[PDB]
């Protein structure tokens, strides 16, 4: 579950922290919020390697572009470079991104699909839990949201995904990009899925495991 | 559901605002009316990715055309669309209507179906929802209509297309291309549904 919500003086994006490997949870606390540039952040859903690789590549080329032009990078530049890359690979790079940020032009919120189609909106949701999140966004969203209202709506939209979607779970990551301010990355903004104390300690008596051989390994030169 | 209609003062482009993934509406406020030049616009139907990629390339070609040879004709714009759609027909799903206003040629409409063929018409309809309004549009279309008559024609037509086609809905966006300039119109469900 990933969402983006526009507000008064900027844009906020949020994501859950569950990484799956079929029905198995591989990572209970993975970071789906990626930095393309200091004030342009990207929420990624779909093929995990593809979202990271495509976000890092465009982030690299945006940095070189920003140095070349002596200008702060624009969201439309990251949007254009991502969509042209994804389109060229005809959907085989399974990256579904919500791109947001602030630049000299203002605050922006976009979504990109694996095939290279882009959408504009005040509120967006992508991933397996997008329908659970979009239900909340469609119910509670309004024009002229404050910063604190947009964070609440975004985290509520992710929570809908966490609880109701089996694909989504664990924690809520948030990034706030406000105009005229530094972007604040709120890693584990909410942690409503803390593991309860175990009933028993499974610390074994020393010598429980049968050993055949011991040897010192040489790591030094 | 998309259409472009020539009239006395120029041409009007019309479209719904629905983007679908199967039966899920990915975007209910989509803008399918896209600028490739000051007064040359297109209606996009088919793959959102393909139609965007094409329109972006055409806008690039016409910007480079303008830099060297000045304002391109609507026919020239339709030719560039055709060239991309025809030569890449095996890898594209794009049904595009090209509409533009010249001062000499006035309002012109070119439709480009899947094959990449070009058809110059007084008006054009396309998209999944067009099937339901062939009968209606043929019976109600007149040449040299007024602006208000053409807006009513598009509004009533897309209203029916939206009503019957599940793949069409949301708002009715319209773009008016005349000598006066470029005017964006929008019409909400509460108005057009009860026509």
């Amino acid at each position: 579950t990933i969402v983006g919500v526009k507000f008064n003086n900027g844009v906020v994006i949020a994501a859950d922290t569950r990484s799956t490997q079929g029905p198995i949870v591989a990572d209970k606390n993975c970071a789906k919020l990626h930095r393309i540039s200091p004030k342009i952040w990207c929420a990624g859903a779909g093929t995990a390697a593809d979202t990271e690789a495509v976000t890092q590549l465009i982030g690299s080329n945006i940095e070189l572009h920003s140095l070349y032009t002596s200008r702060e990078p624009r969201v439309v530049s990251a949007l254009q470079m991502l969509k042209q890359h994804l389109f060229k690979y005809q959907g085989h790079i399974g990256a579904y991104l919500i791109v947001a940020g602030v630049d000299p032009t203002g605050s922006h919120l976009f979504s990109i699909h694996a095939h290279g189609s882009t959408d504009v909106g005040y509120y967006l949701s992508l991933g397996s839990g997008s329908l659970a999140a979009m239900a909340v966004l469609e119910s509670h969203w309004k024009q002229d949201l404050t910063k604190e209202e947009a964070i609440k709506l975004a985290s509520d939209a992710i929570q809908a995904g966490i609880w109701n979607d089996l694909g989504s779970g664990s924690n809520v990551d948030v990034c706030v990009m406000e105009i005229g301010k530094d972007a604040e990355y709120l890693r584990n903004y909410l942690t409503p899925n803390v593991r309860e104390e175990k009933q028993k300690s499974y610390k074994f008596p020393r010598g429980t495991t049968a050993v055949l051989k011991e040897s010192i390994v040489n790591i030094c030169d | 559901s998309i259409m472009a209609v020539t009239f006395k003062d120029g041409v009007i482009l019309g479209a719904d605002s629905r983007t679908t993934t199967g039966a899920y509406i990915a975007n209910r406020v989509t803008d399918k009316l896209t600028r490739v030049h000051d007064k040359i616009w297109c209606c996009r139907s088919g793959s959102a990715a393909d139609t965007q990629a094409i329109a972006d390339i055409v806008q690039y070609h016409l910007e480079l055309y303008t830099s060297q040879y000045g304002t391109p004709s609507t026919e020239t714009a339709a030719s560039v669309f055709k060239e991309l759609c025809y030569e890449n027909k095996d890898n594209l799903t794009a049904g595009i209507i090209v509409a533009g206003y010249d001062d000499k040629n006035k309002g012109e409409v070119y439709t480009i179906p899947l094959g990449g063929s070009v058809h110059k018409l007084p008006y054009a309809i396309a998209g999944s929802g067009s099937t339901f309004i062939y009968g209606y549009c043929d019976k109600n279309f007149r040449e040299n209509m007024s602006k208000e008559e053409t807006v009513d024609f598009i509004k009533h037509s897309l209203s029916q297309a939206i009503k019957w086609d599940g793949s069409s809905g949301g708002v009715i966006r319209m773009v008016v291309l005349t000598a006066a300039g470029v005017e964006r119109l929008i019409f909400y469900p509460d108005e057009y549904e009860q026509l």
């Binding site: 699909h113 095939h115 | 719904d16 993934t21 799903t93 793949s167």
Partner: peptide, 5 residues
């Protein structure tokens, strides 16, 4: 799936 009126 892809996005497709």
């Amino acid at each position: 799936x892809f996005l497709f009126x």
